[PDB]
Amino acid sequence: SVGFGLVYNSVAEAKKFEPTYRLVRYGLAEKVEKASRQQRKQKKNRDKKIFGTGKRLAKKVARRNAD
Amino acid sequence: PRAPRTYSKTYSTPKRPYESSRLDAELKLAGEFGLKNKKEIYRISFQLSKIRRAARDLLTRDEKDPKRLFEGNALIRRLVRVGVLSEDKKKLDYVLALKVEDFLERRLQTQVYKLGLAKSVHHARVLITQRHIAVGKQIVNIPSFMVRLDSEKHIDFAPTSPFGGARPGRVARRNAARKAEASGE
Amino acid sequence: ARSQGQINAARRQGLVVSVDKKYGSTNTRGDNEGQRLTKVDRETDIVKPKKLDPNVGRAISRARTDKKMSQKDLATKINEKPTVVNDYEAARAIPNQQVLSKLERALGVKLRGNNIGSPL
Amino acid sequence: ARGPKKHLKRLAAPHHWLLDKLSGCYAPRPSAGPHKLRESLPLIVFLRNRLKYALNGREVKAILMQRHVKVDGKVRTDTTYPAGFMDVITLDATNENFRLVYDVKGRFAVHRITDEEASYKLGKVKKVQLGKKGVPYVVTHDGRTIRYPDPNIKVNDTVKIDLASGKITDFIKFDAGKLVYVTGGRNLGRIGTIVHKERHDGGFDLVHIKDSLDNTFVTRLNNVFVIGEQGKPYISLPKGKGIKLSIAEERDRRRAQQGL
Amino acid sequence: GKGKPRGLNSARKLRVHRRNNRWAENNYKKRLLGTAFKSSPFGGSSHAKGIVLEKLGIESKQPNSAIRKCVRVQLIKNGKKVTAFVPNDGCLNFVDENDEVLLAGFGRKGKAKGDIPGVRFKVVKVSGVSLLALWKEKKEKPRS
RNA sequence: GGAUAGUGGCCUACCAUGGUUUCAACGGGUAACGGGGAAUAAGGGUUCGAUUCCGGAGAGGGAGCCUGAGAAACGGCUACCACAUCCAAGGAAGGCAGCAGGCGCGCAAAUUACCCAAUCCUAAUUCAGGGAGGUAGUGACAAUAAAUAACGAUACAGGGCCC
RNA sequence: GCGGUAAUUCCAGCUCCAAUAGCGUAUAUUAAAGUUGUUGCAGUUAAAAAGCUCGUAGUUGAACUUUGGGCCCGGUUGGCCGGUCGGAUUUCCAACGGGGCCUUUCCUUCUGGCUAACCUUGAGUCCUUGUGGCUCUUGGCGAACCAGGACUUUUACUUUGAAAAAAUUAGAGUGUUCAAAGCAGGCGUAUUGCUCGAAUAUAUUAGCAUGGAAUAAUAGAAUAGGACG
């Protein structure tokens, strides 16, 4: 069999230069739990829709939805 | 867009499709060397036609110009290394007199039978496609291998492949356990 | 040619060479031809064309009557005509080894001289 | 179409980058820089096709961002940097000094030199002109303009310019019988002499080139580049020494050197 | 002699003469006026989906006699009513009224076959199957 | 002279009747984007090129214009025309010839999938983002490599010719 | 063309044939097609010489104007070569042009820039008796190359060169296990690495430098307003 291999001096510099998916392969980094990409772009759209700080709007819409 | 992977067909179908002579001649070829489909024969005659085309239109060039010299000596080198051309036929005229069975002789399909190993061309076919044939240290399962010069030495079995020792296989194993349970206990 | 000689002898009957085209691809009548017709032409005499015994024909009659068919059913079973089947019963016929082979492969009855009447 | 291309697909870059057809659509599209995108080569294809110090653009970016690659002496972190002709890409880590000079075939190959001669690059001038406050100046083909020249310099003369001083050192006045390095067309990357020189006044004047091994050819004059004195070039030269063997004797040299 | 002007400058005369004698080839004018995309019943297509209107008794030509069991269909895209043959045996009775069949050409570019007179076309499918499959009983028709 | 980035009938005033053409102008067709090329190939050729690259052109039809080095930008605006949406019937926002998806049209042509990891790109920029692009699924368009059994052991028949 | 009573063509079965993980169909372009013809058609009668002349375009058009190298070769006149009873030749041999070979191979010329090398001598030193041998110019040699000129009938033609994006195509290297493909890879001392590569051809008219001066047109000097000076 043939594969391509890397050895490192200074394991700190190794994980500096290392691709983090291989670090997850080696247990050297946590398998990152991020949202599905559809969910991330959708939250991004809500993020760019809500101008301001958001709770400035949430306060007044809660006020108006009260009555 | 990533570029098209260029590809081509590997043969030409014959132009007059029902000629009794072409039928019987290719039938002696196929039923002599165990050829599965006539795609095999037509691929061989296509390779022969391509070299025959370059040989005609290269032979038309004058002597001692480096195009004819270079492509000619390299073409003869390729035919020598495959082995269809004899060691002393090395001239740009003997290359066009090749028949089709001269290219069929250097198929590993045939080379297994010629070197022994099978008691048949057809047994050679089924053995190669069941992968007990390893050229040196590489198994092939291609019957149309178009074998080369030096590796005809290295035609033998595999470090696997129960003919090449090393842990016999399926039906032998089932019959071994079967006789062990039926006659031992 | 030693190796393919052993191969083709290991296959069915063959000859010392086996590369020459036998001809007439659905001429299934070449069992008796190539030696006998070129005898009878060369003879310039009279030859005796004879079928063997009507015991073969009555074996056909017994086997057909036991298998509950008729002559015409047997003819459309063997892809031949009622006349050739009927003459093969009633013994006014001439032999054809190919047709006798179809009668045996449809009936399973020995039509062969000494032994008569079992699927071999 | 409304403005400048920033993409450039593979099957459109020059062929002296020798990029495979696949594993992308795209080809690493030089930024603006000193050298033209037909005659330059980006650092990314330099490092990962020609030196094999990385496998990924991630990797090449980190490599340049560690501030070691001093392309003409200055640290470059730009992946899309057009490294081009007579370039002195040096390091500190492997302590190596590469000069971008061609092949016999026309390909920017590797040419590993010492620290000496890693301290000067050459350059053909392509216009010499007068500017502000009466100050003359001279151009090169990386676009290095230099004020206060030797007035002995004319156009089509070459200059040895160091790395950091500027400060025009030994130039070469152009005339007949000089070693030049033809860098275009099919005569790209062959070396010869200035056996004859011709002016077709108005369009595309030419120069006869005779190499060492008696092969005359005749090039245009934006492809000429003086590398110096007769048998005395100011820098080092690759294998082949810019001679362009015929293909049959090329095969013969390959086959003879193949094995002992 | 020979007619043509063999002159080393006579090529425009040569080429005009060729271009204007090309139309007597049946196929150069037939593409280049644009006659498939004008007045053949199809628009350069090979098959067209049609609607069945009528079942026709076209009786064969002189050295034959038979009633040929053709069908009279209308195109979808263009409105043309046109005869079409219903091929092999018993497959007339597989077609009823308005069965949206599929029309093909017939084997000679757009002339007839043998002894049906005047017909150009044929049916290959009825409402989305076939006729080979229906004739060999290897497919059963959906019911609309 | 103005306009323009700049030449220029590009436009304006003035002043001359010129310019093209049977060596095919002008006008009509086209199922006309062009070129790289593809097919078929003795040679000479003939047909095709919407399409993996360059150049063009367009963002429903048509013009105008801010911003900006660069757009007559439409994943920008304004006007009209054509088409259709949501309302509490007061009004408001529109652009798939981007990616999947749907309808119609048809002889007629895919997942409302996973992801910056590759190759590239963008920026304040190693990092963020990229339906560019990559990755699987559908997929007999095509193109290649080529399983459907090998080795035996077996028997019955005729019918020539020597006897 | 089969099918109108014993269908080698329909519908089935049996058997076979071919292409085979493919086979058929429709339609369209290509070859077949010397049935579009320039190579390369045909016109008495098969389709097809205008009723006949004139004639502008187009297409075409009689003849004529001299040649710097030699080595080898053969061919004709020829002379010292005439032997043979006016013919009978060899070759030490010119050239008469002719076929290959390396080159004479050049651009025709001033305006001088500048001279490579001198006709040498400016005398003798180093060293074998010294035209052996340089450091050198005062009487010579410009083309080895430069730019202000004048050579200037313009082309059509052909040779050569630079351009003739990448893929494609032809093809060189390479065991992608064969291969369609790709641009790779290959060897160790595999333990701290060596190295070849990724060619070449082709592309056209249109240009743009370059040689060739046959072919094919085109200008002269007649009512000498001519060149020479």
CB E74 within 8 A of CB E25: no
Same domain, yes or no, for D16 and D106? yes
**Domain ends where: D116, D135, D153?**
D116
As a whole number of angstroms, the distance between CA E140 and CA E82 comes to 27
The whole-angstrom distance between residue B27's C-alpha and the CA centroid of its chain comes to 18
The DSSP bridge partners found for residue E104 are E47, E122
Please report, rounded to whole angstroms, the spatial distance between the CA atom of protein residue A49 and the C1' atom of nucleotide F91: 22
Q: Cα angle at D110 between A16 and A9, to 5 degrees? A: 25
Q: Which residues of B lie closer than 8 Å to D, measured between beta carbons?
A: 1-3, 5, 66, 69-70, 73-74
Q: Is residue D249, in this structure, part of any structural domain at all?
A: no
Q: Which amino acid is at D64?
A: L
Please identify which residue in the block is written with the tokens 């004195």: D229
Same domain, yes or no, for D103 and D10? yes
The answer for B 113-142 residues in CB contact with C (under 8 A) is: 113, 119-120
Please report, rounded to whole angstroms, the spatial distance between the CA atom of protein residue E60 and the C1' atom of nucleotide G2: 14
Q: For residue E99, what are the CA distances in angstroms to D147, E67, E80, E128?
A: 89, 22, 16, 9
Q: Is residue D187, in this structure, part of any structural domain at all?
A: yes
Number of H helices, E strands in chain E: 3, 5
What's the maximum distance between 2 C-alpha atoms anywhere in chain A? 73
Q: Of B111, B107, B79, give the one whose Cα is nearest residue B94.
A: B79
Same domain, yes or no, for D147 and D225? no
Structural domain containing residue D50:
1-116
Number of H helices, E strands in chain C: 6, 2
Number of separate domains in chain D: 3
Same domain, yes or no, for D1 and D45? yes
SS3 content of chain A, % helix, strand, coil (to 5): 55, 0, 45
Q: Is residue D69, in this structure, part of any structural domain at all?
A: yes
Residues of B in contact with C21 (CB under 8 A): 24
Same domain, yes or no, for D225 and D127? no
- Surface-to-core class of residue E111, CB atoms within 10 Å of its CB (0-12 exposed, 13-18 middle, 19+ buried): exposed
Same domain, yes or no, for D158 and D78? no
Closest nucleotide to E12, Cα to C1': F23
Would you call E103 helix, strand, or coil by DSSP?
A: strand
CB D91 within 8 A of CB D104: no
Resolution as reported, in Å: 4.4
Minimal CA separation from D60 to chain A, in Å: 11
CB D129 within 8 A of CB D117: no
Query: E20 beta carbon < 7 A from strand G?
Result: no
Same domain, yes or no, for D156 and D183? no
Residues of D in contact with A8 (CB under 8 A): none
- Surface-to-core class of residue E129, CB atoms within 10 Å of its CB (0-12 exposed, 13-18 middle, 19+ buried): middle
Residues in chain A, total: 67
Beta-strand pair D206-210/D216-220: antiparallel
As a whole number of angstroms, the distance between CA D86 and CA D76 comes to 17
DSSP line for chain D: --S-----BTTSS-GGG---S-S-SB-----S-SS-TTT-EEHHHHHHHTT-S-SSHHHHHHHHHTT--EETTEE---TT-EE-TT---B-SSS--EE-----SSS-----EE-STTSS-EEEE---EEE-GGG-EEE--SS---EES--TT--TT-EEEE-SS-----SEE---SS-EEEE-STTSTTEEEEEEEEE--TTS--EEEEE-TTS-EEEEESSS--EEEETTEESS---TT-S----HHHHHHHHHHHS--
Token couple for C86: 């009927």
Q: For residue C1, what are the CA distances in angstroms to A48, B107, C13?
A: 86, 19, 16
Same domain, yes or no, for D104 and D155? no
Q: Of E46, E57, E47, E74, give the one whose Cα is nearest residue E116.
A: E57
Same domain, yes or no, for D3 and D104? yes
As a whole number of angstroms, the distance between CA C69 and CA D177 comes to 113
Query: D210 beta carbon < 7 A from strand G?
Result: no
Token couple for C15: 């000859």
Q: Is residue D251, in this structure, part of any structural domain at all?
A: no
Minimal CA separation from D92 to chain B, in Å: 37
Same domain, yes or no, for D26 and D100? yes
- Surface-to-core class of residue D190, CB atoms within 10 Å of its CB (0-12 exposed, 13-18 middle, 19+ buried): buried
Q: Which residues contact D162 (CB under 8 A, 6 or more apart)?
A: D119, D120, D121, D169
Helices marked H in B34-158 — which ranges? 38-59, 66-82, 100-104, 108-115, 121-129
Query: D196 beta carbon < 7 A from strand G?
Result: yes
As a whole number of angstroms, the distance between CA D75 and CA D90 comes to 10
Residues of B in contact with D247 (CB under 8 A): 66, 70
Please identify which residue in the block is written with the tokens 């094995």: D259
As a whole number of angstroms, the distance between CA D34 and CA D126 comes to 14
CB D117 within 8 A of CB D162: no
Task: Identify from B29, B112, B119, B122 which residue to disrupt to test chain C contact, counting C C-beta atoms within 10 A and taking the largest count.
Answer: B119
**Domain ends where: D80, D97, D116?**
D116
Same domain, yes or no, for D110 and D152? no
What's the maximum distance between 2 C-alpha atoms anywhere in chain C? 54
CB E57 within 8 A of CB E63: no
Closest nucleotide to E48, Cα to C1': F107
Q: Which amino acid is at E11?
A: A
